[PDB]
Ligand binder design. Structure first.
Ligand SMILES: O=c1nc(Nc2cccc(Cl)c2)oc2cc(Cl)oc(=O)c12
Lengths: 108, 107
């Protein structure tokens, strides 16, 4: 495992997975349970922290930028699909600032 | 610093000359663009021109500050615009370059 994927796993994933705002992102958006039959029509590449966490556990990624895109897609889906005033956008914004903070200090 | 210098000369240069960068090079003009509700939804406007000026006048203290500004620019676009607007796609494309370039920032 590269230095960077190790960093994304041990520093970034560790910080975001246990955050108090993380629960809505720990598993794929359930459009039935959440009652949103337009979600999969708007968001065509769903993404979530469980998938990224699993992929980091199973050495699915070949480069750090690959794991970094997944994080970006997860956040960007939220800002694209949700109303500007939904609390989830603000939770997503808080997590993403931590993501960016951490990645500013990723090795190499 | 070395991280701020990299964001200026590697990251910002690549993003600035891109064929999709032109809507992001200067602040959104809600008058000239007919968007009288832009500033009611978007309370912190941001744009590459601002970020570049700040890089040049030593406004930033740490790299993460400047990257935070990049993100706000992209997020404002996703939040304000309809999912189907071409500008969302131009944002995502530029944002992938940003993330790629940021992954190779010297620590
Ligand atoms: O991305 C999203 N993920 C979730 N997850 C979620 C929400 C409540 C419980 C559980 Cl266990 C998971 O909630 C959302 C709600 C809405 Cl309206 O839009 C969204 O885009 C998202």
């Amino acid at each position: 495992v590269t230095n960077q994927l190790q960093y994304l796993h041990k520093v970034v994933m560790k910080a975001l997975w246990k955050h108090q705002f993380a629960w809505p992102f720990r598993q794929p958006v359930d459009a039935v349970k959440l009652g949103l039959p337009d979600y999969h029509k708007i968001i065509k590449q769903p993404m979530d922290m469980g998938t990224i966490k699993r992929r980091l556990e199973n050495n699915y990624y070949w480069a750090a930028s690959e794991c970094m895109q997944d994080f970006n897609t997860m956040f960007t889906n939220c800002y694209i699909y949700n109303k500007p005033t939904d609390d989830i956008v603000l939770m997503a914004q808080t997590l993403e600032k931590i993501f960016l903070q951490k990645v500013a200090s990723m090795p190499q």
